[PDB]
Structures are given as structure tokens and as C-alpha cells.
Amino acid sequence: RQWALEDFEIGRPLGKGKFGNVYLAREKQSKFILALKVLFKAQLEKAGVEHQLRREVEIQSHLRHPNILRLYGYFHDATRVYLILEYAPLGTVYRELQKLSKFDEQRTATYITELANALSYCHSKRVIHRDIKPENLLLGSAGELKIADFGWSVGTLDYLPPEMIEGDEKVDLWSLGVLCYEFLVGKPPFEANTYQETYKRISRVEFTFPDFVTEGARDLISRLLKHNPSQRPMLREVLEHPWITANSS
Numbered sequence: 001r002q003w004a005l006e007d008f009e010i011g012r013p014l015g016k017g018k019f020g021n022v023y024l025a026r027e028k029q030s031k032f033i034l035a036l037k038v039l040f041k042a043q044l045e046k047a048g049v050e051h052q053l054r055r056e057v058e059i060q061s062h063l064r065h066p067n068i069l070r071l072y073g074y075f076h077d078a079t080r081v082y083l084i085l086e087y088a089p090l091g092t093v094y095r096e097l098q099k100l101s102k103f104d105e106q107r108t109a110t111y112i113t114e115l116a117n118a119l120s121y122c123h124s125k126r127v128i129h130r131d132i133k134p135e136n137l138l139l140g141s142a143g144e145l146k147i148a149d150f151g152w153s154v155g156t157l158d159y160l161p162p163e164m165i166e167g168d169e170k171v172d173l174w175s176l177g178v179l180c181y182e183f184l185v186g187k188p189p190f191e192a193n194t195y196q197e198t199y200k201r202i203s204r205v206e207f208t209f210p211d212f213v214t215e216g217a218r219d220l221i222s223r224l225l226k227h228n229p230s231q232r233p234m235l236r237e238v239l240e241h242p243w244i245t246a247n248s249s
């Protein structure tokens with residue numbers, strides 16, 4: 001099942017970063033619409049990440065969920081590596097946040113639910129996820145979120161938990177807590193103007209709520225951000241949280 005660049009017609013650039021950009025694309029024979037991520041080989045080895053990709057790509061190919069961006073395949077040429085990805089027409093959650101400035105309780109609880117489910121499923125197969133950033137969350141035709149990052153295994157540093165910065169399976173609860181906060185407030189709880197300050201805030205778990213955040217949200221968010229991984233809830237507990245069940249679609 002080997003793919004080549006001439007198998008596709010390349011469309012408008014969807015976005016860029018660091019290794020390569022992403023293009024809209026259509027497979028010539030089937031007319032199937034998808035996203036083609038282009039990564040430059042040279043730029044990858046020079047990060048010592050080339051092997052990291054191989055394992056993540058292998059992992060992703062085996063993940064099937066409605067809230068996880070699908071990976072159809074990959075290939076390479078002399079120069080570069082190409083990932084064939086599901087196309088998400090409504091863009092990132094990051095950009096939606098920039099446009100709206102903050103989400104209401106109903107949108108937040110829905111996204112958190114979709115995330116929680118996607119993470120449950122991963123755990124079902126002994127796949128655990130790293131930090132999750134809004135830049136890596138896409139939106140499907142129906143506005144359903146999709147985790148688009150390759151960040152599995154079997155963010156510097158707004159989304160990283162204390163465990164990862166000081167020196168799992170609980171990381172993802174921490175991630176939901178950061179996202180849940182960011183969705184309602186408009187910026188992540190540990191934001192600072194320098195790496196050094198952010199590091200301090202995360203390690204101390206030092207954050208405050210604006211007045212408009214309701215009691216229910218505060219309760220869920222405060223449960224998820226705990227320096228100690230073992231004090232964090234199960235994904236199951238999150239899905240049943242009264243603020244969640246009341247606000248979620």
C-alpha cells in the first residue's frame with residue numbers, strides 16, 4: 001500500500017509549522033479529500049526526532065475514534081516525509097478561542113466530554129497521551145473536536161503537569177483541568193511572560209479564578225489540578241461530574 005506525491009492534487013495551505021506545512025489535498029483516483037502534512041527529513045534528524053515520529057506514526061495508525069484525528073498512511077521521497085491525514089474543515093479550537101475570546105459553560109462541558117471519551121478509549125488500549133494544547137485540537141464538519149497531535153506512547157510549558165517539569169497515566173487529568181480553565185477564561189491558568197515564571201506557577205500549582213467562573217467549574221477544575229497525580233479523579237469521575245452532566249450535550 002505505497003503512496004506517492006503524484007497520487008494527490010495539492011490544494012491551499014491549511015497552516016504551517018516548524019517541520020513542514022499542511023496542505024489541503026485530493027487523492028486523484030477516488031477524489032477523496034484529506035490533509036497532507038509535509039515534513040522535511042533534514043529538519044527532523046537535526047532535532048533527533050526522526051525516530052520519535054516513527055513510533056508515534058505507528059501508534060496513531062492503530063487508533064480509531066471519532067474524537068481522534070485519523071491517520072490514513074505515510075510515505076517519503078528522497079528529501080521528505082508525508083503524513084496522510086483526516087481533514088477537519090472547521091479549523092483549530094485555538095483559533096475559535098481567539099475569535100470568541102472565551103467559551104460558555106455549555107461549549108466547554110461538551111468539549112471536555114468529547115476529550116474525556118477520547119482519552120478513556122486510549123487508556124482502554126494502554127495508550128496514554130502527553131500534554132494537550134488547543135493548537136492541536138481540530139473541529140469536524142459537525143463541530144466535534146478531534147485530537148490532532150501525535151503525542152501518544154504505550155507544550156513548553158503552559159500545558160505540562162508538575163511531574164513532567166520537575167522530574168504517569170494521570171497526566172491527562174491535569175490536561176483536562178488546564179483546558180477546562182482555558183476554555184472559560186480565555187488563557188491557561190499558569191500563563192506568565194517568561195518560561196521561568198510559568199515553571200514556578202506550575203510547580204506550586206498557583207492560580208486564581210475570575211469572578212465569572214461559577215462554583216461548579218471551580219469545583220471540577222480544582223479537582224483536576226493537584227500537584228499529586230494520585231489525588232486526581234478517574235476519567236469516569238469527570239464524565240459524571242454534576243457540572244459536566246448538567247452542561248454537556
Ligand SMILES: Cc1cc(Nc2nn(-c3ccccc3)c(=O)c3ccccc23)n[nH]1
Binds near residue numbers: 086
Ligand atoms: C491536519 C489537518 C488540519 C486540518 N485542517 C486545518 N488545519 N489547520 C491547521 C492550522 C495550523 C497548523 C496545522 C493545521 C487550520 O488552520 C485550518 C483552518 C481552517 C480549516 C481547517 C484547518 N485538517 N486536518
